[PDB]
RNA sequence: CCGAAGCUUCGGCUUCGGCAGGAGAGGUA
């Protein structure tokens, strides 16, 4: 709500990659974007 | 040891034992 | 499986059961090594799977209160001098005293040599106190280990995980047709075999009067005569062989408590679970890559690792509402050529070699009153064979207890002899474990300077990264014990042999030694003994002061450019054999509710193609392999037969139909008052019941 | 400079089972491969004779005990595997051991046929008290190598015959050592010293000659072109 | 290839054998052929050698954590009751040889056989689908064999001596064949520096430019090399047009060579080359003299002095506390900070005592296996251990495993050795639930078209500049900018364009961008695709497993969940 | 390329088979539909009159129809259209 | 409802689906696997499944 | 005793001076008994001739560059050590090469001493460009194998007799691989696949034909200690 | 669907005979 939809995807794709990079596992960012894309696909109605 | 007929197995131990299992 | 496993089963402390915990509810704090386990529970011997920390073993010196609390002994010390008075303490009373350590230098009078000693304070706090506060002391260095962990030489040089596996894998060894004791041992093997109870000991003193293969007669001093019988080729709970043999002469004098007869895994009264083999530590053409093992052919031509396994089959004869089943040779459906190994009673004859699908007993069922006789005969299952060694028949008319409703019982025993082969699992006492990768001719094997081939080859890449260096020390000491040594004392005893006993300054070839679990042979002693060993027939010393020897190549003939480590090591055979794990199937029996193939090896079943295996198929993009795997090979009842006919006739495979499990699901959903229907492109629900 | 001295063989006898053979002067390098060719042919393909089946009277299988003997049948079997036999005929020959009464059964009690000779008249086979007799009928055959047990009901036999594993090699241990001559003036050569130890059926100089026939007849499918 | 037991192939291939047996007039009816096959008559061992020819099977090991847990091979009949597996597929299967088991499945129809032969063949699946790195690579024994062979030892037998007066070069060879003939006599060592005339090996770039200039027609053009024999026999394994390397083969160098071959050559020469690297590795591993004895685990020379100094420094702190100054945590903290420096002085004395031709050193220095922490534990001192709660014990373990621990040291060593094993067993049941939850949500994402012609994108950092004015490459750029499609053209200082819209980002494009003063770039990502159902091929980018653009119809959804789930059991820190 | 001759299941090399098709998912269907035509020809030639075409390339001794189909594809003797 | 009932909480999803009278179009990977049809990915899509192959004119004329 | 299955040799001509002989079926274990001894008999028993010393003019000391020619002495040696020569004599002979003038001295200029012949008279030895003269005196003797330079010590007669290495062998590279075959129900059989590459003075087929005549008379010293020995008969051809 | 037995015109026809679920414990990777 504070920033917007585009910044949540950076925060998520970065906070997930830090955990994997700490222990030395290399995964491309295009693999986490596929799953993050499915987490933001719906809208909540305020008034109909 | 402590058993009537047993093979002679020599040991490297340097400590003595005051109890038996 | 063997005497050690039976002894260990009876000393187990289990945290589960009706009143305790659950494998799912238990967390991570009930599976930890508390500081209060010292002397009451073994921290090493525990399962490796989901029961890690929920099952443990009692220690050797522990004992139980009249309330249920485990105690352990200590030696009381006063004024800095260790006494010889033993007091048993529970974990709630030993946390108010300072308890010293077993490995502490003690003088002749009993005073500590070192000014400060390592002790154990109240909350398991380890400290370095000046030796003047000690209040108690340990009784022995092996107070904190169990009966299977105290049988590993050089235990203090091994990591905890590898010692854990070595102790767990010592209980899976199988008895072999001939047994032999370790060259390097620990001394626990003598009282671990008498207390297990698989040997025969004498209850009184006397002279032996008569000895045969199955009885021993002892004449006592007072006049009474006692005779002991033996179990020859008896089947244990796990299909192994339990055989007892006498080890006394016909005029020997026997004292009370002496071992009279041997047992399954026993050699002259002490437990022996494996064999001594000559080892080399080197890579070899990639045949021992990633924990594989290379063997020699002399281990098959000389029956070094061979075991006998026995099987048991039964059948029952009962009555029926149409008559009474009868066991007889007369069967009007099959020929007379396959009914030649049966006697005049319908049973096989002792000494006949049966095979898969052969006949064991002959039984028929009446269908009512002739030609009402049906065939129901006990046959050998798939992939079994062996001679017939015994038949036990129980009858009703000869006054024998029998279940109500049955008339006759019969049991048939079948035995086979299994040699070593590819896929069989070998092991050591230190955590070494692998399957046999290759078996080589004895001329293809590296050989020493006098022409002696090696018996087993182990890889060098697995030792440093797993921290079990006790095996290399074991090979060094085993070579020294096998060859025999002699320490020179012309100019006095050498400096490195000051603390050795006087009976260890000289040894004979094929000598047996003992290194206790936490007080044994140091490394100065081994390094000094490696340069004192005796020569062979010709005056040559093959292994130099480092424990390394120069080997020749048996395939090319040239010497290897660098010396290689050689020695003797103790190898056991584990009960995970490849003959009991191979399986295959094309078609066979199917289930009843969901018409899928059956499961298991005894029922000629199939292999599960689970959920995780479908994701790989969907990620490859293979849409036809998955469809064929899920319909015409599992459930499509009408397509299975057409597929078989097409394969036999050489035509094209047909198009799959619809699985039966879906229809079962639909009738399940309809039975919960749910109106589920399958529509078409324009309504008009499809019938989905065939019939046309 | 090319040499001409043709290799020459020469033997020396240290015992009646061990012998050494010198073969000088070979060419620089050809000293370890000739030794290994002969050790690999001497420890595999030498013909001999071995026992292949036994038949005690009263026993039916090998998992039982006879009455009056202090061993079961599997130990008499594992003690009849160190018998050094010899033969001259290419057909099975039946021996006979029949001993009774208190004593110790040895290998000197096997009355041989005519063409078979037992070479170990002092091995152990069992111990007898005054209540048992041992009647065995051993079958001797000739062959090469190591053949596993020939199954029973797959050969047309009865129900008392016990097949046995047969090892037909008459050789025990073979090694070699090369003494190289690496001088200057580029005049180098070699020298091989083979050592052959045979059991007791074949002299150390008839095994080298069976391996010399095998190798003089396997390296002949090469000189078929010229 | 694989190896299949005869009694298993007979049962798996029963109807094909029955048909072949009836066809070849070996029987009359199907029942007769069935009985003959089931009785194992000696006539069925010859048809079951052309029946199973070019008929693939599928091999599977459980758990199946990713795609490469199923692969298709070509069966061969062997003797025994075990299946024989290639050494180079154990990394993909995750299979050691201490008791594992695998299952076999048989395709039947034409479509299933074609899919197994084309999509699933083992020699087609070499690159990992999660990072694009090679999986069928030399490891363990092969690495040691190839590191021993290509090592230069100064002052060896028959090296180049630039002498004058007495004799000439004495160590120049006219062909590799002459060098081999000299090495068969003992005059020359494999790892001795020499000068050899090479004819069929391609010279390095600088030598080629200096000598031939326009091009090197290597079929018959001769040059001079200053190398060893092992390097020549190693370079004779690489393809014909690959330039000479002349380097020691650490594992990183081998990985780089394999990656270059995979990205610049067809996929059949790579499969033919790994198989011949494995042979040489296995051959030279057994002649390298790596062996373990208790006289190779050398101890530190001056260790008791180090320890006594760092024990006096602790008894002063103890005295202080005995009187009073610190509470308890200050004490424990200073004891930890003394016993964390003593292990580093012991470590740095051990890393200076050990020679460089030790079997224990060249196994961890060649990249085969192991660390130096294990080497310090085995021959130096173990150090500080942890209590069951998770805090360090202020008393250290001063004895190595080469000298043997005492009763109390061994007992307090098991507190942290049990926790690792319980946490390991427990964290295998929380990563297969995560995988199952990830597969189900992203199961409807499939490449549906070729291009949506959208204009949106995301911004990628792609290196940053230092205050001095020198660019610093981003440490994480292989997993964020490589293998992507540009969204807008890359311009610089209001000038021309270096790369154009719609181009993959390999290393040449990256270096061209970096050497022109460009940091921020705009790429096309799946997060901003305009396709209604599924995604398009251009937005996704390049497939990591094959190295080209994606195929219409792929299941990009399951690969993303099987690329985030397997890497998870190797995840536990605190 | 500069490869040695392939053996067994790796013939013809797939890097040349993939130059006649759009992707690796169409090659599967291409080969699996030619193999079925060849098998139908073999099993209908000995009975009556059919309409399919036999192997356009010379077979071996006992060759699977899939191998013949792949060899026909590699020799540029067939043609296909995409749905 | 077929894909959600086989994931978790079968009773809740089945009750809600029964009340709402939902309809399933069977257009996913899991549903096509369950009922026994070709999945809509890889070689199971329309473009690749409807390939028509016939010999070229010149080869047909030659043989 | 009989072998059961008689082995057979077959060839596979690749080039003109390279072949690939295959010998199968061999009883289990006889593939490694026949490999290393055929490789070594092939690479160190066949006689031949090669250059053993040279004496280029104008080099009393420092062997760096000779006046007139465009090559150092090491390249002259490398080009005068790959000469396929042959001699029908006994003791050392002597050859001469004297070309004076702008050109390219080649192997077609060494006048043959009536009896020895040069079989590759198209190789390049040097390129005399700066109007000079080359005079080389070579000594070609016979032998067997690879003999490293026989460093002498004439101390006077060897004013500048550079000693070279001598590749007397007519074969240049042999390699072998043992495979596996099937004879009935028994796999684990053997198959040897040699690979001989020769020079220009012998054909690859007379090598495995004259290396089976120095091994049927070396292993024939054993089958003469007792002629009747009960070996393994191979049977009629 | 398999076996046994008859007719069998060689496509097949007829008689008889025949089944497979849960709970707990231990183990291997
Ligand atoms: Mg494993
Ligand atoms: Zn898009």
CSV table of C-alpha atoms (C1' of nucleotides) and ligand atoms in Angstrom, one decimal, chain C residues 291 433, chain E residues 61 94-100, chain I residues 28-29, ligand 1:
chain,number,residue,atom,x,y,z
C,291,UNK,CA,32.2,-46.6,-2.0
C,433,UNK,CA,30.4,-49.8,4.0
E,61,UNK,CA,15.7,-43.3,-8.3
E,94,UNK,CA,22.4,-38.3,-6.5
E,95,UNK,CA,23.4,-42.0,-6.1
E,96,UNK,CA,26.4,-43.4,-4.2
E,97,UNK,CA,27.2,-47.2,-4.3
E,98,UNK,CA,26.6,-48.3,-0.7
E,99,UNK,CA,23.2,-49.9,-1.1
E,100,UNK,CA,21.0,-47.8,-3.4
I,28,U,C1',17.8,-50.1,4.1
I,29,A,C1',18.7,-45.6,0.8
J,1,LIG,MG1,23.8,-44.3,-0.5
